[PDB]
Curated annotation (Swiss-Prot):
Keyword Membrane appears in the UniProt entry: yes
Residue(s) carrying N6-succinyllysine: 151, 656
Name used for this protein in its record: Insulin-degrading enzyme
Enzyme class label: hydrolase
Subunit: Homodimer. Can also form homotetramers.
Organism: Homo sapiens
Annotated effect of mutating residue 787 to C: Increases catalytic rate towards INS and amyloid
Lineage: Eukaryota, Metazoa, Chordata, Craniata, Vertebrata
Domains (record comment): The SlyX motif may be involved in the non-conventional secretion of the protein.
Membrane-crossing residue ranges in chain numbering: none
Post-translational modification: The N-terminus is blocked.
Family, as annotated: Belongs to the peptidase M16 family.
Residues at which ATP binds: 388, 854-860
SUPFAM superfamilies per record: LuxS/MPP-like metallohydrolase
């Protein structure tokens, strides 16, 4: 009978009957709520802690302190004081880890090889026991946070996110600045005599209290074993009985309602944000009146708000529903993007909104809708895919805070109560008398008179004219607006087909004709009534030239726009498709309950092959596409770096500027012509994978072919015109640099590529092992020590059959300098591989092996792996055992000599390309001295003047 350390252990966690995992919920004596998960099949174990404090509890005079504290627990505790003990332990044991801070939560998660849960968890527990907050770490780390913020400065979501806070009640914690930067966490604290290390110590001690913590742990250990484990490591987290913060008063009071904000964006975008304050609905989780109204106002089917708004050519996409706030307040929003016509009809757009809200009011609550929503969720739950442990633990850790233990798994899914009163009550708040309207549009350049402090956002504020409100308050009924009708796409066949006699472990090539290559595998693994049906359509006309590339794109976009109304049912019913053009021709994937899949597929291909373009729709989509082309000049420096490198190293690739130019010559006549052309010769390669039989799959494939032949007279592509593109072949010992300026962002970016060779069993493992070995040392050096920026990445680069090592960094320092430090770092690595024990070397092999061998948890994960073998024409489905068997063979001498051949600064076959992206305005290890780079003036000339690699041979 009773353990002193456990307050209780009832009862029985409700899981899906499909869910093979075992679960124990429990509460420690110190008040920590805890879920244990035993899965004796798992390859990685995982754990997570969530503390119910976050940025909303920041001291007013030190903004971002809790985000900063989160950064700091990683950098040393009393029991494991090495600045990077934690993260290195993880790396050498196939783990990874992150954290985040919302306004009420700080959330910490890791995964490790199943065999080392305990070692991981023990280091992990110390974050919550005796963090060091080293003076020297704090000094460095504040920069990583300053970077985390700069990254966000010029991004439109983050600016709008803060603007909202800065326009509500300034006295309210909602208005606080979450991220924090260097100014708020080092400069102004010094100016005001604060010792931040103390302030972190004070804050950790004040709020990281056990009564405010929830833990989840997933491992192969029995439930009893996990219990002992958790109790051991966590019983000594101290209970300081902290009252859990509430915010009963809304940040939007009367003076904050009936306001119009006109806002200048960074990207050339136009949207309208409509938003009403609502009470906190969390406690209504079993009826969920917010979701009901969301499902409705947000509907995109026939008769919906969105589809009238879009027929009138005013908006294109809509999102509506309940938005989080914190304990005590929430929002209900309706946000749309805007056409040019739309921008001019904002007053009208909102009337339409209120006419629809009025309709809902007119019909009253609807139990049949509730019933649909509830059934949909029952089914979602019953067959939810197995989640990756890290996500799972992190997520549940969050919600242990809201639901009884027994309910944690089901609470966010199952609906129980039908609540016409709550439905009605929330609806009563969606009124013009407490509306907020915000317009984001470049047309406010200069017309602005305010500036948001933290992001610099410029905008104007205004009371909506008393007599615009009145006009909205009288919103009539409007007969273009109907409730949605029954969802016909809801599945009702869930039968798992039995496993065939000749069924196989990997996909089989079951059809090899000139028209198509069908790869097929019945699911032997997850047994859910779902499937994935993937297709590459090859046509050389998709990417023959910039003009065509645009056409391929627009066609597909107008097609998706056209099916949208009908497709949406299917999406709600757990059946979705994804359709986009590639450099190779087109891609189509259909995932979800297999029951009604063949209906949706058929509808897609048919529409595709008999497509009839609305002209108004074309003109709007095109104008939007133009903007998204420009809008690249506002993506981030490192994305630019990455993007130029892709352009520089692929045989064929059209630039954003080329596409922009060629976009003007795209006319209705021209597109109409293009489509039948595209569809007239194709090849199809497909993976059909899931709850389906060989006969079913063969049929599905042929139905696709048949529909095309029938409506597009499609016929086969010639084997020889199955063009796959090559990577540029860099000379032995060369170094080229390409330079560009980012105009928006005041940071710089850099990608450095050391190209090694073709992919091959041996060549792959040489690069992979080296990547694993440097993986954390790189992060720990270039970011944690050197603090070059927030974004510091290294790893293998694999494109068009060739490979290499890359570094990507976004910094404040110039690329000339970034370059220098990577090279410095690179020598440190030859050194430390020389110095490391055979056993340290073997651990790395074992860590790679484990990452490589980790088994898929869900159908779409397994599909992805195969689809990679297929899209890359390597067709090596057994690559993981092969490549791993070979890895174990490798010795230290092999890696030293691999590095010396291909990577060292004076490597006989070093092949280096750097992309330098300059910012809007432009004691340490020893950097080696570098050659004069060759500066690339012209991308085409560069490509013309080098060899191209071969392409890989298949299995
Ligand atoms: C259940 O209700 C729905 O289906 C709607 C409506 C909709 C989706 N697509 C067409 N309409 N879908 C929603 O996602 C509504 N809403 C999203 C607001 C969160 C948010 C967060 C950050 C920045 C902006 C906004 C809640 C949700 O996730 O379900
Ligand atoms: Zn952070």
């Amino acid at each position: 009978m009773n353990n002193p350390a456990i307050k209780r252990i009832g009862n029985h966690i409700t899981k899906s009957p499909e869910d093979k995992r075992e679960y124990r919920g429990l509460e420690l004596a110190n008040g920590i709520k805890v879920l244990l998960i035993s899965d004796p099949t798992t390859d990685k174990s995982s754990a997570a802690l969530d503390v119910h404090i976050g940025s909303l509890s920041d001291p007013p005079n030190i903004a971002g302190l809790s985000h900063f504290l989160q950064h700091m627990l990683f950098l040393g505790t009393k029991k494991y004081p090495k600045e990077n003990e934690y993260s290195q332990f993880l790396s050498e044991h196939a783990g990874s880890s992150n954290a985040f801070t919302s306004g009420e939560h700080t959330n910490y998660y890791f995964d490790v090889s199943h065999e080392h849960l305990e070692g991981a968890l023990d280091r992990f527990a110390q974050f919550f026991l005796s963090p060091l907050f080293d003076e020297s770490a704090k000094d460095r780390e504040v920069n990583a946070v300053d970077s985390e913020h700069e990254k966000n400065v010029m991004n439109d979501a983050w600016r709008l996110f803060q603007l909202e806070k800065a326009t509500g009640n300034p006295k309210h914690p909602f208005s606080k600045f979450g991220t924090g930067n260097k100014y708020t966490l080092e400069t102004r604290p010094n100016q005001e005599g604060i010792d931040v290390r103390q302030e972190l110590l004070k804050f950790h001690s004040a709020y990281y209290s056990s009564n405010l913590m929830a833990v989840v742990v997933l491992g192969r250990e029995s439930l009893d074993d996990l219990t002992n484990l958790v109790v051991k490591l966590f019983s000594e987290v101290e209970n300081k009985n902290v009252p859990l913060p509430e915010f009963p008063e809304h940040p939007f009071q009367e003076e904050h309602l009936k306001q119009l904000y006109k806002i200048v964006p960074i990207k050339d975008i136009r949207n309208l944000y409509v938003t009403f304050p609502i009470p906190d609905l969390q406690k209504y989780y079993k009826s969920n009146p917010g979701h009901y109204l969301g499902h409705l106002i947000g509907h995109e089917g026939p008769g919906s708000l969105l589809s009238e708004l879009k027929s009138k050519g005013w908006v294109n996409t809509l999102v509506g529903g309940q938005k989080e706030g914190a304990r005590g307040f929430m929002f209900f929003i309706i946000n749309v993007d805007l056409t040019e016509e739309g921008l001019l009809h904002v007053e009208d757009i909102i009337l339409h909104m209120f006419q629809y809200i009025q309709k809902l009011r007119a019909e009253g609550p609807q139990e049949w809708v509730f019933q649909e929503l509830k059934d949909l969720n029952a089914v979602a739950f019953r067959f939810k895919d197995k989640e990756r442990p890290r996500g799972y633990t992190s997520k549940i850790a969050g919600i242990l805070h809201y639901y009884p233990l027994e309910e944690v798994l089901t609470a966010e899914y199952l609906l129980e109560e039908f609540r016409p009163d709550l439905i009605e009550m929330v609806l009563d708040k969606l009124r013009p008398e407490n509306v907020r309207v915000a317009i984001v549009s470049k047309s406010f350049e200069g017309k602005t008179d305010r500036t948001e402090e933290w992001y610099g956002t410029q905008y104007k504020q205004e009371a909506i004219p008393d007599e615009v409100i009145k006009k909205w308050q009288n919103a009539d009924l409007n007969g273009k607006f109907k409730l949605p009708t029954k969802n016909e796409f809801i599945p009702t066949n869930f039968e798992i087909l039995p496993l065939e006699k000749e069924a196989t472990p990997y996909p089989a090539l079951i059809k090899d004709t000139a028209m198509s290559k069908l790869w097929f595998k019945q699911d032997d693994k997850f047994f859910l009534p779902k499937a994935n049906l993937n297709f590459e359509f090859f046509s050389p006309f998709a990417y023959v030239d910039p003009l065509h590339s645009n056409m391929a794109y627009l066609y597909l976009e107008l097609l998706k726009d056209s099916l949208n109304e009908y497709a949406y049912a299917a999406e709600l019913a757990g059946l979705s498709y994804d359709l986009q053009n590639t450099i190779y021709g087109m891609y189509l994937s259909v995932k979800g309950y297999n029951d009604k899949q063949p209906i949706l597929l058929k509808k897609i291909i048919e529409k595709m092959a008999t497509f009839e373009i609305d002209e108004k729709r074309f003109e709007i989509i095109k104008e939007a596409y133009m903007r998204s082309l420009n809008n690249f000049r506002a993506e981030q420096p490192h994305q630019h770096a990455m993007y130029y490198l892709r352009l520089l190293m692929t045989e064929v690739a059209w630039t954003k500027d080329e596409l922009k130019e060629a976009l003007d010559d795209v006319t209705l006549p021209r597109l109409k012509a293009f489509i039948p052309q595209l569809l007239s010769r194709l090849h199809i390669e497909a993976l059909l994978h899931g709850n389906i039989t060989k006969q079913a799959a063969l049929g599905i494939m042929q139905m696709v072919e048949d529909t095309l032949i029938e409506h597009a007279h499609t016929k086969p592509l010639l084997p020889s015109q199955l063009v796959r593109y090559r990577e540029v072949q860099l000379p032995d010992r060369g170094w080229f640099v390409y330079q560009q300026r980012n105009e928006v962002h005041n940071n710089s970016g850099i990608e450095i590529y050391y190209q090694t060779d073709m992919q091959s069993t041996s060549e792959n493992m040489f690069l992979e092992l080296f990547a694993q070995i440097i993986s954390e040392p790189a992060f720990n050096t270039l970011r944690t020590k050197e603090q070059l920026g927030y974004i510091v990445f290294s790893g293998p680069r694999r494109a068009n059959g060739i490979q290499g090592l890359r570094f990507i960094i976004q910094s404040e320092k110039p690329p000339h300098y970034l370059e220098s430090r990577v090279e410095a770092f690179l020598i440190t690595m030859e050194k430390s591989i020389e110095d490391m024990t055979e056993e340290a070397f073997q651990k790395h092999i074992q860590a790679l092996a484990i990452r490589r061998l980790d088994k898929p948890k869900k159908l779409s994960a397994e599909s992805a792996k195969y689809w990679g073998e297929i899209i890359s024409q390597q067709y090596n489905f057994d690559r993981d055992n092969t490549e791993v068997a070979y890895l174990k063979t490798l010795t230290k001498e092999d890696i030293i000599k691999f590095y010396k051949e291909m990577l060292a600064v004076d490597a006989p076959r070093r092949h280096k390309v750097s992309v330098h992206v300059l910012a809007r305005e432009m004691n340490l290890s020893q950097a080696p001295a570098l050659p004069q780079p060759e500066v690339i003036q012209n991308m085409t000339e560069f490509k013309r003047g080098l060899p191209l690699f071969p392409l890989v041979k298949p299995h």
